[PDB]
Paper text:
HPCA or hippocalcin, is a member of the neuronal calcium sensor (NCS) protein family and is highly expressed in hippocampal pyramidal CA1 neurons, in particular in their dendrites. It contains four EF-hands out of which only three are capable of binding calcium. In response to increased intracellular calcium, hippocalcin undergoes a conformational change and translocates from the cytosol to cellular membranes through a Ca2+/myristoyl switch mechanism.
The structure of hippocalcin is similar to all NCS proteins and contains 4 EF-hands (helix-loop-helix motifs) and 10 α-helices. Electron density revealed three calcium ions in EF-2, EF-3 and EF-4 binding sites in all structures. Cryptic EF-hand 1 did not bind any calcium ions, as expected. The crystal structure contained two copies of hippocalcin in the asymmetric unit connected by insertion of C-terminal helix of chain E (residues 181–190) into the hydrophobic groove of chain A. This packing is facilitated by salt bridge between guanidinium group of Arg181 and carboxyl group of Asp37, and hydrogen bond between OE1 Gln184 and NE1 Trp30. Interestingly, the same fragment is expected to be involved in target binding. However, comparison of hippocalcin crystal structure with neurocalcin delta and NCS-1 revealed a different orientation of the C-terminus part of the protein. In NCS-1 the C-terminal tail appears to be able to sit in the hydrophobic groove in the absence of ligand and there is evidence to show that this tail acts as an auto-regulatory mechanism to control target binding; it is not clear at this stage if the C-terminal tail of hippocalcin serves the same function but it also sits in the hydrophobic groove in observed crystal packing. Equilibrium calcium-binding titrations showed that hippocalcin has a high affinity for calcium binding (Kd = 65 nM) with positive cooperativity (n = 1.4) as observed for other NCS proteins such as VILIP-1 (37), recoverin and neurocalcin delta. We demonstrated that hippocalcin oligomerises upon calcium binding with molar masses consistent with dimers, trimers and tetramers.
Numbering used by the authors: 6 to 189
Write the structure that this text describes.
Amino acid sequence: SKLRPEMLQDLRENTEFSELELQEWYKGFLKDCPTGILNVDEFKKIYANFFPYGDASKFAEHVFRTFDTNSDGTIDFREFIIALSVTSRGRLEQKLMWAFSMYDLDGNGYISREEMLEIVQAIYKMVSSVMKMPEDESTPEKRTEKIFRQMDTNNDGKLSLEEFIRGAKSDPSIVRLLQCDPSS
Ligand SMILES: [Ca+2]
Ligand SMILES: [Ca+2]
Ligand SMILES: [Ca+2]
């Protein structure tokens, strides 16, 4: 019930957690999920702490699929800690790559319109009960309407990775973050 030296090392290489933190996380993850596999229903219960279960469920399924890199139906500790590390301590570039893999539902390497609207509908449903939204990006259709007409360079009905990454950096919260670049 400690990571084997060889696995510990492999995870220190593929994450931004220290040994102690990986050790602590493995203990916790096992203590909370004695099987060492986290399924969809379990994951939705994690999300339901933060937002009503029924509301968050469709977003929680989309995220679960992004964590589940081999797409077998469950998240093992490697898949979980890696995915957590990227999203919580990753570089902004690779955060947004990970978000792109999520938005791109068929995995053809292009965010289609009906792919975008799906995810945004789920994000809006999850938060509907607590967040009050802007006004112009304040229905999913309204929001999705903004994105493509701020992001679709050629207007090929699709968003490539490159159109997405750049587009997102105007997201107001990313505009806040860039003012903290330690390259003053
Ligand atoms: Ca899996
Ligand atoms: Ca696609
Ligand atoms: Ca395009």
